Each structure stands twice: as structure tokens, then as C-alpha cells.
Amino acid sequence: FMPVKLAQALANSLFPELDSQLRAGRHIGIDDLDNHAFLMDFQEQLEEFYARYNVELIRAPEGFFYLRPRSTTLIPRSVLSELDMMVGKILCYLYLSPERLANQGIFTSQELYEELISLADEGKLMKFVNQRSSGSDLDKQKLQEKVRTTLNRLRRLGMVYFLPNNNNKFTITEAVFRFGADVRSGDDPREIQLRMIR
Amino acid sequence: FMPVKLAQALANSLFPELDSQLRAGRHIGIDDLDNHAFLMDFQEQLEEFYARYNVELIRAPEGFFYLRPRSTTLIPRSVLSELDMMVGKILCYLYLSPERLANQGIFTSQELYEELISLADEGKLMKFVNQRSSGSDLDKQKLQEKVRTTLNRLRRLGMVYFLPNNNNKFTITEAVFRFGADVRSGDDPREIQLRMIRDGEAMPV
Amino acid sequence: LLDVLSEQQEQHQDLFNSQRLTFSEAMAKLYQRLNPQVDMGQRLPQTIG
Amino acid sequence: SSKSVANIIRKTIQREQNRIRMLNQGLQAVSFGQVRGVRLNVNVRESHAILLDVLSEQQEQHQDLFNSQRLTFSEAMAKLYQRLNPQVDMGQRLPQTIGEELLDYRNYLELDVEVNRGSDGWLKAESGALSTGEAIGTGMSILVMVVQSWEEESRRLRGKDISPCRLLFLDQAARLDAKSIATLFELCERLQMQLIIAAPENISPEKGTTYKLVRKVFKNHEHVHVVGLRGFG
Amino acid sequence: APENISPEKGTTYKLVRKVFKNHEHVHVVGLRGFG
Amino acid sequence: ELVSWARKNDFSIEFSTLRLSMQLSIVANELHRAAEAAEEGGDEFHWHRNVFAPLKYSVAEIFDSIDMSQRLMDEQQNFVKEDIAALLNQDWQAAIANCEQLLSETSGTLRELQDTLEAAGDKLQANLLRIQDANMGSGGSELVDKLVFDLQSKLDRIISWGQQAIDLWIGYDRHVHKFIRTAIDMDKNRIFSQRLRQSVQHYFDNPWTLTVANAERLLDMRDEELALRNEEVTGELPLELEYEEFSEINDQLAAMIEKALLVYQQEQRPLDLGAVLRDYLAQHPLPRHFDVARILVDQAVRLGVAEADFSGLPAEWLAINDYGAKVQAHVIDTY
Amino acid sequence: ISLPVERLAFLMAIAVLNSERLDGEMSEGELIDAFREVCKGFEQTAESVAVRANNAINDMVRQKLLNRFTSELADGNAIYRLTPLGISISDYYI
Amino acid sequence: IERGKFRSLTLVNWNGFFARTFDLDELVTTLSGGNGAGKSTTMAAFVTALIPDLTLLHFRNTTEAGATSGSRDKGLHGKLRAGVCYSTLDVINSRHQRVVVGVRLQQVAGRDRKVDIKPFMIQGLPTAIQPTQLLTENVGERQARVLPLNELKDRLDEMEGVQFKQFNSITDYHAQMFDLGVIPKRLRSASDRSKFYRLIEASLYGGISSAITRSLRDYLLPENSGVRKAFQDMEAALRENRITLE
């Protein structure tokens, strides 16, 4: 038979959308009040339910819930591409302390683009677009299109929340710390995050 | 909270493989066994369970099952390509064709390409791999490699399985009959296609 | 086990008062009732007691 | 099903016995110490032959053990092996593990080496009775027989223009005696066999190349100094 | 020790097994005063 | 090697099991007769005319005929496979009963053949082992070994195939079995087949592609790809390999001492360890003396033994140098 | 019936290997290597080794020279055997 | 016919060995040294080069076996230093063709003791070019550097005639080695590799000592799945019997 409380949780009317987003790979932070509270209540059973898929329902120290696929994940995995990884670190680096002095939590594609160009090495930028290119405007446009694509890809995962308009301005969720290094008391966020980006 | 049989199915050791791989776009057949051997036992329970995510586990008169997301699907939607449907129909013909029963279900990419090019039109087919092709053998090789890649992607989506020691030889799922969704009945293929898009089963690319 | 022996064996008499097993076997069965995760080298409960 | 399992195990054992007695042939008179010949002996172990017989003809008569919900299939097998042939009685290594071992047909066979030691005839090459160099030569003989079979099989596929490279190893060569070492060298070169041999003391000074290794501690790490050696003193 | 340690200090005894007139035997040469 | 042989040659262009039974009977009789004659162990010519000429050719021919029967069973199982395939093509649904009956009778035929094979293999193997035992009745019987060798595998091979075929067949059957519930029960009237063919011939005029929830399977953080331990290591490259005559630091003098004691062996001269050590150590400085003494002793003692050791009288600690070094040693007398 | 020099050579080669074979069974993984060796010793390369070997094995099977048996565990997932016709051709010379 | 011959073994950045090269004898090569001289490390490095299948490699030594010989990591990671390291063998083919097979090993990051292994092979290398020199660059006074795979490819490609190949799979590595008469058996299957490794590891230990006698069954007798399937059928029947009884 099945645990009764697990039956209660899976029968919960909030179970379907939460489960679908979790399959997608989307994290559930404290901002998702209903999903977060449901997860907090029924974690003891949902962890088993997802581990049956060989997927761990991990609550980060930041409190956000996400599905860590094991190697044997019964849900075949997709992964964030190389540009996705570095743009995610740039997003965390856009969510860390210094952004409070520059964007107050509301950022634009221009901010991320400028930070990516100034901080990231030209070699990895060319690796993103192409090794033979050199600073040309068309290559910059292709890089910007890829930046928009990866930004939306992060959006699907609940890692960036878009402001409701076609303009590419958004806020960054705490779950973005999965990209960045774990913060320690007395550590400069800028120093550690730059060392990891370098 | 739940009916006895539905909780039973959700409790089955095979259930997680089924659920996860169906969410990952894999489909039900003789191959893809772990998702079929017991879903034959709880088809109705799994269908009503999946309706909660605004998705339907659809069985045609064929014994294969496959997942279809609604417009309001909670799990996001996506589609395949024309060449994928092509290789799929060829695979379905192979699956049904008793003449190749001696193959015991094992088939090689060369056999697949031979049958495909025999039944289909080489040039009009090749128009879609590359728009400009005009019978260049380079484009023919491109089409063969694309057939290989589509076979790989169909493997990812539960139509075919490479043998443990052979990626060139493979075994076919009954989910291949999904590709015969426009031929599973004697009605017009276009009106059936309209009924699939209505039931979100297929859309033109 | 020492603490239980001090103050809670009286909940465990059922194990103690059973003619099935001897006093040392009773101790072994209690100890393995405690720390249940801890297996032994599949030895006689007589020896464990 | 039990009868079928017993029958298939017995057929496999007989086939392997035939194959091993087959492979035994084609051995030259090695001269390792007093050992003047080597041979392989394969036989069915009685402890497991009795178990096989019970399984094949008397399965039902102990179904009580098998339907015991407390016993897994391997544990059931182990407990049955305890019931009959109780001289093997052993439960400190878990019954599950012993049953799992019992789920290997190969274990059921005694597979040993006989040596033509002097004129005593073929004696079981027990390590407590043979000089250790003689035992090492016996093991090398077994290994070379195996690799001879390997090469001979692939003889067809390989063109005769290529004779495949041959190279085996032997650590702790100090065990061997001069007779065994010389017999090993003569056998290997007769078989065009290359060897890499190790010993604390240089037991092969007059044959082959020789290196000596010395390990030194240096600034919290380690280095190995390798020095050549030459055939005299 | 089996002679693979045999340091300078102390009474060093050299045990060597041999058969003397069919008698199992171990000859023992002594050394000391070293170090 | 045979490749060129052929190249330059330039050449180019009864399943009844009773046959198996009579062949097995003939093989048993001939094999027992040949084993008996080998056990008789006549001269070399008798050995030949009893164990190579009759044995080799007769057993080879009948093994090959038994394999011919096996190959006829192989062709027949192939035939029934193609016949089942063709019958499905013509009767479709109506062929189910015929196909199942054909599978049943083929399984029965294979089972009876396997039983006929196993009926004599074990005893024939015992006969071959008897011949192997008898083969050591003549040194020149090596060639017989090769036959006694070969014929075993052939026999085993036969038996192997005897089982292997069924192992294949029973598998193939299940495929056929599954086929009936995975091809025809869903296409009882076959219309799906022709309609699928027509749709394939005319697909693009019904342009449709299947919809799935395949937007993302499971997106996740990428691995720390190929991040490995490394230090751009450097190291003092080995110099020209030095050479030393097998620890010549000790072994030059080992040769010297083994010679200077091999003299004592050669003349069986009584060896006083005290006197020899004292005379010797003078050639070397004190810090080396201990290293010297061991090397000397490891040599001197191997040469004979001291007879006074068995008198019950302990030897004394004779001094052998300054600084206080001493040696307890009886005079070596019995080499 | 049709046996080019290379095909007939491959046939004797398979026959000899079978006479040497442990269990008489021939996996396609060995057939491919035998075909490679015979073509190598004949020194012709029209196309890949794989395609030519596939065509040759199919030709002999259809020409009632080889019997094929699918087996997923076998190397190359298939096994092959000489048919009586192939046997009678190989032995006629050997 | 002149059987091919192993010429020399080069261990780079190994535990205790930075750029060492031992010239193998035609017939017999001997290693000597007291406690912990590292001979087992040399044998392990050779066999790792021969069979780079990380799974099979598990080097409990002949004596003083187990982890304490430096093998809780399977005797690979810890028997290496950190970073790029090499194990390469020169072979003179029976066709008299020099070929340097080799493997680049690297310690994997983290608390784990896994090793990243990459096979490779070189042909046409001039007989004079010593692998030690080929695999090292003289940076700093008399203390040379070791160069990674990419730098090795650059250096070799800059040399005329020499052809350097990397195998995406160990299977093709062994296939090429066999085609050059380096292997007696075509290890087409991982099982063939397993039996091969069994033979070499048994020879390494040598004799009929406890391990060799215990594993003689595996060495000689192949595994049979028929027994396993029969046992599993018995198991299923027993389970269903119990179900019916209850």
C-alpha cells in the first residue's frame, strides 16, 4: 500500500502545477508562498515520492526547493549550457550585494550585457559565439540573442522573474545562489564570485 | 484521498520509471517496457491521474500509449519534425511487417534507410533536410546522418532502443504506432489530423 | 542500555519474562531492541548476552 | 524448475570438465626444481554434488524450508546446504552470502594442479609441500597455457607476418630458487616470452637487464632514484 | 628479524638453520660491542 | 596464409530423429570398439590401424553426418520461420492457429532432438575419457591425442548446438508470440497496413507532427566539467643512469670475501671467525666495521658448521678489533 | 549459385574457423573480421568494410549458404552457421 | 618470425616517479629494492597503460596487499601525484614498426580518488626520440616540466611523419594494438578485457598463492548465464508458490 499522508499530498489540488514545474526543473523559493508552504508541510513524503524517480527534493539553506537529478535520474536530464552557466553566475553577481547600489533589485538586459562583456574574458565570449569572430557587430547581435534565449531559459526554471512587459527587465530570485559560491561570514561576495567567474 | 487501484499503481516499483520517462517525452510500447508492462493494468487510473496536470495518456486502438499535453498543459509542450514522423512511419511498417519477423525485432540503420528511400521519394524528401538540395550526394549523406540523429532523438523519446553493445542495431517500441495516428482509422488523414490537433496529438510544423 | 536498565526495564519485562529465552538471551534481545540498526556477527544471543 | 537448474548445472560442469581436461594437453616437460611436469585436475565437489542431487530429485521433500517466509532464496539454499552435508555447517559468514556463492556453478568444481614432482608421479601441487619456486613455476605454466590458447585461437585472424608481443610479470621473485628461475627463463625464451620480474634481492643478476629503486624523503614529498646494475660484483 | 633489519647496536645473533649429521640445527654466531 | 592459397587457386563460379538414433547407436558401437582396441595397446602399426585409420575417418564422417542432420534441422527451422512469415502474409488473422501449431510442433521436434543427443553424449564422453586414459599406452600416440582432443569438442559442440538451438527457438517463438498480440490483434483486418503505406507514399499532403510535453526533460545546473587536479608540475629530470655492480658498495667486497672464504672451503681449512674477523677488519675503518662483519659472517657460516657447538661448551666472546667489538664463535670444522 | 573469388575464399575461411570453433557457432562479430582479413589479403576497398561485409553475408544467406540467428547477447547480436550446401562446397575441396 | 618486443616504459609524474624511463630487456627485466621501493607501482603503471579500463584495475599487491600499499583508491589515484601524468610503452612490431602506445592519467578533483584516463598512440616517431624527452619540456634550470595532452599534440604535429592518434574508446585502443600484433586476443568484448586482466594480474602476483588458487576458477572457467537464468526461474516459481499458499 501507500503512505496515507503521501496520498493526501499527491491528491492536493496544488500538487499538479508544483509537480509539473519541478519536472521542468523550476525551483520553488520562499516567494512562492503557496508552493513553499505546501512543500514545507509535505516534504517528508514528497522527498520519498521524488526519490522514487531517483531525484532528490533538496531544500537549500536559502530555503528554496529544487529537484537535484542523480546520475540515474528517471527523468532524463537537460542541462544549462556553458553560456547558461556563465550568465547564471553573472545573474548571481547581479543579485549579490553590489547590485543594491546600482539597480535596487530591478535589472535590465543592458546591465547583464555590460557586465558580461566587461567581466568575462573575450576568449569565452568568442567560444560562446564563435572562435573566428572578433568584436563584430553581427557577432554581438548573435551573442545578445543567445543572452536573451538563456535569460528566458532561466525564466522557465523560476530563477529570474520577468517584469510583465516585452521589455527585457526583470528581478533575480534567491535560488540564483545555486550558481554562485556558498557565502561564508566575513567573505566578500564580490571577491568569491569574481574568483569563480575568473 | 485516492482510489485503491490508483494508489496501488502509484505505489508500484515500476511507476516512477513510467511517470518520469513519460514526462521526459518517452512513449509506451513493447519496448519502453517498464512504462508499459503495468500501465496495461492501470490505464484508466493513470489517465485520470495525468488529467490533473492538464495532459492525457492517449491509447489508439493500437496497444501503445503516449502522452499529449493540453494547451493549458502544466508540463510545457513541444513537437517533433517531419523527418521524425517519416522514420517513425517506416519503423511502424517494420513493426507490423511480418516478413521481417525473422529479424526478431532487431533492425539496423542501413535497413531503415533502405526501406525509407524505397517507399519514399528521395529528392522531394531531401528538400526538407536542406532546402537547396538538387540531388547532390553530399545532401544524400546529410540526409542519412539526419536519419541517424532522428533515430537517436526517437530513442530519447521512447520509439527505439539501441542494443547494449550496438548503436547501429536497435529494437522498436510499439509507441511507433503513434506515427500511424493518421492511419489508425479509415477516415481521411486530414480530418483525423484535425481531430489530433483538437486533441493536441499532432500539429503541423 | 544502562539508563534503561536503571529506569525502564519495567517496560521491557515482556521480553524478560518469556520462557522462550534465558537471562543472557534476554539481555541480548533487549540490547538489539535498543540500537536496532546495529547488527551483530550473526552469533548466538547466548554469547551476545 | 529445480530439476532443470540441477540438470543445466551438471551439463555445464561436465562441459567445463571436458574443456579443462582438453586444454591440459600440449605441455612440455618444464624443469622447475624437482617438478618435471604439470597438469590440471577438475572434478565435482561432493558437498555440492549431494546438494545438486537433492535439488534434482528431492526438491519437494524440503519445500518446507523453501516456502519459509523468513528465508530468502539464497538463504533457503544456504540452510538446505546446512541440513544435508552438515560438516560444512557455517553461519558466521551470513547464509545469504554462502547461498549466493552456491549460485555459482564454477565453485562446485575442485580445480587444482598436479605436478610430476621427481619420480613421485603426479602429486597435488600443494603449497605446503612444493618448494615455493616450484609453485610459482606451476602458476606461470598455467598462465602460459592460457595465453598459448589465446594466441592459437587468433592464429587464423592474424597474419603470420605478425607474431604478437608476449609479456608477463612476476613479483617477489625471491621466492623462487635458481632452478625455478632458470626454468622460467628457458621456458619464456623458448616461447619468445618477455618477463618483468621483481625481488628484494637481485635474484637474476646474470640474465636480462636490472634496475634498483631507492625511495628518499625530500621536502615533505618522495622521490624514487633508479640506478642501473651490471652482471658481476 | 629475517636479517632485512640487523642494526649495529646490541648483541646480534646470526641464526642459520642447517642439518648437522641429520640433526636439525641452527648455528649461532654472536657479535657485540658495535656502535 | 590460406588467403593467398585461395587467391592463387582462382576458384569461383531426413529430419526424422530415427536417423539420429541409428547414427548415435553406430557411434557408440564404433567408439567402444576403438577405445577397446586402444586399451589393447598393440604395436605402433596396430595402434594406427585401430585408433587413427578406423577411428579418425569413421568418427569424422559420422560426426559430420550428425552435424549434417543438425544442419538439416537448421534449414527446416529456417523453413518453418519463412513459412510462418508467408502464411501470415496470406491469411493474416487466419494464420494464428496454423502458426501456433507450427511453433508447437517445431518445439517438440527440437526437444526430441535434444533428448536424442543427450541420450548418448554423456556415455560417449566417458568413452572419450577412456580413450584418453588408454592413449598413454604408447609414446607415439600424440596424433591420437589430437583426435582424442578434437573429437571431444565436436561432441560437446554438437551438444552445445543441441541446446543452443532451443535457446534460440524458444526466444524466437516468444517474438512470434508477442507479434500476434502486437501486430494483428490491433490490425485484425490489415487495413492499417495498406493505409499506413499509402500515407507514407503521400505524407507531406497531410503535414502533421506529434505534440508532446518535451519542452524540457529536466533542466539542471551543468557539471563542473573537466575541473581536475593539476599544478603544471616540474621535476628534476633523471640524469644519465648510474650503474653499480649489484650493490657493489657491498658486493665488490662480497665477491672479495666470498673468494677469501671459498678458499677455506676449497682446502676445507678450519675457519676461526675471531681470527679471520680480526685480521680482516683492519683493512676498513671503524664506522664500516659492522657493515663488514655481517657480510663476512653471512659468508663464513654458510661454509660448514662448528663441531664444538655440539660438545655443550659455549664459545667465548673473542675480541676482533679495538673499541670493544666482540664475536662469539666456535671454530668451523665440518664442511 | 554464384561465388566470386572473394566470396568463395570467405566461405573456406568461415569453414576453417568453424572447424576450429569452440562451439561451432559463428558470431557476426567474427564473420566481419574474417571478411576483413580475406579482402585485406585480396586488397580491394570499394567501400567501407562494414557495408561490403554486410552485402556479402546477406548474399551468402540469400544464396542458401548461411543460416542467420538473431541473438541479442551474441557479439554483434547475431550468430551464423553453415548450411548443408555450403558444407558440401567447402568439403568438396577441403 | 621475429616476435614484436616491448622496448621501454616511461612513468611521468607518478608517485615517486617524475620522468622515469626503464629500458625493457628483450627477454628478462628485473627490478630490485628493499621495503617500499615502489616496484609494485611500476608494474601497476605498466598494466594501467596496457589496459586503461579503470574498472578492472584494482591493485592489491602480491604481498602486504590492500589499501595500506596505497590502494584504497584502487591503487591508481594515490599512486599518482596530482595533475598530468603519463604511462607509455614503446613496441617494435614484428613488422619492425616502432609504436608508442600510452595513456594520460590525471587525478580527479574532490574528496574522491577517481582518475581521468585518456588512451593515445604514436607511430613514425624517430627511434632516437626518447619518450621522456618527448613528454617533457625543459623549463627552469635542470628541473624540466611535464606538458599536457594538447601541448603533446602540438609538439608531435610539429614533427614530420609522426602520426598521433587518440582513442575515444578503450575498445578501439585494443583493436589497434592487436592489429599491430600487440595483443594475442581480440578483446572485442569487455569480458575479453576482464579475462585478459585476470591473466595479467594473476601473473603479477605469480604462483598458486591464496588469491591465485581462489580465482583460478574465474581464470579458467567462463561465466555462464544459463545457470543464472535457471536459478532466477526457480526463484520466481518459489515466490509465486508462496503467494498462492498465503
Numbering used by the authors:
A (entry chain F): 9 to 206
B (entry chain E): 9 to 213
C (entry chain A): 1286 to 1334
D (entry chain B): 1236 to 1468
E (entry chain A): 1434 to 1468
F (entry chain C): 10 to 22, 119 to 440
G (entry chain D): 22 to 115
H (entry chain B): 2 to 247
Quote from the publication.
MukBEF activity within the replication terminus macrodomain is suppressed by the sequence-specific unloader MatP. MukBEF is the SMC complex of E. coli and other enterobacteria. Its SMC subunit is MukB, which associates with the kleisin MukF (Woo et al., 2009; Zawadzka et al., 2018).
Although the map was resolved to only 6.8 Å, which prevented determination of the nucleotide state, it was very similar to exploratory reconstructions of nucleotide-free MukBEF. Hence, we refer to it as the “apo state. The apo complex is comparable in size and shape to apo yeast condensin, with arms fully juxtaposed. The apo clamp is more flexible because it is not held in place by ATP and DNA, but clear density was observed at lower contour levels that allowed unambiguous positioning of MukEF. The apo form, however, lacks both MatP and DNA and therefore represents the result of a completed unloading reaction. In the apo state, the heads disengage and tilt, and the joints and larynx become closely juxtaposed. The hinge follows the tilting κ-MukB neck during DNA unloading, and the hinge-proximal arm changes from a straightened conformation to a strongly curved one. Intriguingly, the neck gate is open by a narrow cleft along the interface in the MatP/DNA-bound structure but is closed in the apo structure. The minimum backbone Van-der-Waals (VDW) distance is 2.8 Å across the interface in the MatP/DNA-bound state, which is reduced to 0.1-Å minimum backbone VDW distance in the apo structure.
